[PDB]
């Protein structure tokens, strides 16, 4: 068959303790780390099921998982039965829309992933989110991962993604355009697209380039 596997995000230790005891009572696989076997992401939300954007949130959508509210856990406890978590699926986030229903979109749109036919190179550096995690995100959304600017397949459409904050001693993010004929955009492009599960126009996110 197939087994329920949850991870949590936005929870405090004491809250985690609740989900742990909860997962123990009901025999639900609980883990530290999101993988392909992961079925549900349990998000801390407000009473309307809006959450903060965390890596686990992005990855839970990218993978088309059930991103449900931590209110499911508390409410199931309160009624001594496990409630249907579909009734608690996360509706939105404090950034992209309080009701954009990105989780539902990705869940129903696995056949038409948002990054089909796109080659993305995550041109480092980055912070608060490891380059391989950003890379896995795009892939899960149907993107093709290019390690090097040279590795761009010529003939698909290419996109270089950077986080200009991370650039310590460089304005070098304006030089990228030189070393390859491709659009350059901030990480917020990837993120905004994944949360809404809709591929954003690049115009807003483009980084000025020097020829």
């Amino acid at each position: 068959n197939k087994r329920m596997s949850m991870v949590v995000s936005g929870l405090t230790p004491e809250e985690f303790m609740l989900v742990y005891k909860f997962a123990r009572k009901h025999h639900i696989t609980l883990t530290n780390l999101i993988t392909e076997e992961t079925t549900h992401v349990v998000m801390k939300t407000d009473a309307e099921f809006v959450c903060e954007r965390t890596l686990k949130y992005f990855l839970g959508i990218a993978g088309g998982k059930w991103v449900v509210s931590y209110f499911w856990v508390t409410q199931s406890i309160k009624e001594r039965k496990m409630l249907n978590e579909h009734d608690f699926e996360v509706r939105g986030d404090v950034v992209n829309g309080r009701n954009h229903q990105g989780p539902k979109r990705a869940r129903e749109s696995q056949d038409r992933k948002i990054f089909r036919g796109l080659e993305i190179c995550c041109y480092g550096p980055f912070t608060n989110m490891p380059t391989d995690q950003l890379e896995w995100m795009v892939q899960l959304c149907g993107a093709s991962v290019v390690k090097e600017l040279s590795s761009f397949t010529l003939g698909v459409h290419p996109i270089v993604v950077v986080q200009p904050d991370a650039w310590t001693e460089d304005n070098g993010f304006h030089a990228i355009g030189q070393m390859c004929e491709a659009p350059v955009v901030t990480r917020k492009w990837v993120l905004d697209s994944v949360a809404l599960y809709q591929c954003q126009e690049l115009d807003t996110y483009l980084i000025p380039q020097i020829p």
Binding site: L55, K56, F58, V95
Partner: peptide
């Protein structure tokens, strides 16, 4: 939580 947020 300690997990990084993106806003």
């Amino acid at each position: 939580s300690t997990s990084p947020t993106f806003n």
